[PDB]
Amino acid sequence: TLLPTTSHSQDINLKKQITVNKLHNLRDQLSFAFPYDSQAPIPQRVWQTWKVGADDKNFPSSFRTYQKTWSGSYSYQYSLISDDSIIPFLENLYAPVPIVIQAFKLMPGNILKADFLRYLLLFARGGIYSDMDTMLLKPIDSWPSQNKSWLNNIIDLNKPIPYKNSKPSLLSSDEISHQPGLVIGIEADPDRDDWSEWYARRIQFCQWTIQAKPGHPILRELILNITATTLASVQNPGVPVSEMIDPRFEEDYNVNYRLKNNKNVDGSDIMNWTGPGIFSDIIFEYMNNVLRYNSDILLINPNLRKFYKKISESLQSSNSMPWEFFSFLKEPVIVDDVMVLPITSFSPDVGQMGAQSSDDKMAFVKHM
């Protein structure tokens, strides 16, 4: 295999399908084995994982209440993958792309794996992944990613926002009636007062709850980046990693620039490896990449606001997605096929950055 980077793909159209007549690059291999279907709906399926099943005697008692909100009947299929099942399930799932599972198995320690697992599960099967310390507040068929009524309200009240490379005859709001392919919630507002490293990025999305269609290119790019970083950062890669990476950008693979074993991996390593900072980097890289190469990218922001002129200028003059587009979000926004939810949606009751209570109509999941 060759292991491309995600941070120097400005020369590649990330939405573009690569076809073959009658392979080697891990980006193309993931696309081939897990194709993206923007026309199909999000699967009505919930994924959770823990060391043990829910009826296990060691299942933590403080989680048993939370897990019932997800596992019910929901007019939605629920799957809890116990630790004994994770490896054979990923082996069955990523059989077409075995280097992905090799890397997962080589990850030192339990937190890197549990972080990485959510992206693997969603990319291969879609649905919702939510951590065990989360509570579902409103049924998922009532979410704005799912409820045809809500999606129609977004379509009927908001016109596409143009950008430098856009062609208006291609931009229509009703494309989103096929549902977003990725649904994420703000964790930290980019305009907040706190600039400690409590959160790892300026624009930060909750990693504890994510919804997606299988094959979404952002999940592809996350898996690429984490796969290549793992192999170049562990003591037993099983492959001659130095011969398989981009020769122009060697410092972008080994995690210490940002070998690791079970004893030397710290919290800021996890942060730079599988955590919410790499998630947000990949997401913004993707947003800016698709505007560069496509004339039909749908941009909907019902909150347009104080940053309007800068937003308009970033889009229409610089062809770039400004961080201000995601500031003071009170209603969902659309970037291509990514729906970004307000802080209240997956982070209610934090009494900060405008988060409302889990009683708000925008509150969908409470993080415990």
Ligand SMILES: *[C@@H]1O[C@H](CO)[C@@H](O[C@@H]2O[C@H](CO)[C@@H](O[C@@H]3O[C@H](CO)[C@@H](O)[C@H](O[C@H]4O[C@H](CO)[C@@H](O)[C@H](O)[C@@H]4O[C@H]4O[C@H](CO)[C@@H](O)[C@H](O)[C@@H]4O)[C@@H]3O)[C@H](O)[C@H]2NC(C)=O)[C@H](O)[C@H]1NC(C)=O
């Ligand atoms: C997709 O979205 C659409 C649009 O939002 C959804 O359709 C609407 O669904 C709402 C549900 O919130 C519905 O409003 C209810 O209609 C009921 C039947 O007509 C009413 O009986 C009900 O009244 C109660 O709730 C109100 C809250 O606004 C209270 O003000 C009112 O006093 C009533 O409260 C009593 O009952 C509740 C429990 O029901 C209790 O907590 C109270 O204490 C009190 O006893 C609502 O008004 C709309 O009618 C729907 N709109 C349309 C056009 O159909 C749709 O359901 C979503 N789809 C999915 C799958 O979720």
Ligand SMILES: *[C@@H]1O[C@H](CO)[C@@H](O[C@@H]2O[C@H](CO)[C@@H](O[C@@H]3O[C@H](CO)[C@@H](O)[C@H](O[C@H]4O[C@H](CO)[C@@H](O)[C@H](O)[C@@H]4O)[C@@H]3O)[C@H](O)[C@H]2NC(C)=O)[C@H](O)[C@H]1NC(C)=O
């Ligand atoms: C996997 O994803 C990670 C996360 O995105 C990715 O690491 C990132 O790589 C890029 C590109 O190498 C880094 O981007 C910046 O590039 C400029 C240009 O030289 C630097 O100046 C930046 O750092 C300094 O300057 C900034 C001010 O201008 C400061 O904010 C900064 O702290 C430095 O002083 C920076 O290098 C980006 O920093 C990293 N991100 C992280 C978290 O390290 C990685 O390349 C991907 N790997 C693969 C294999 O795809």
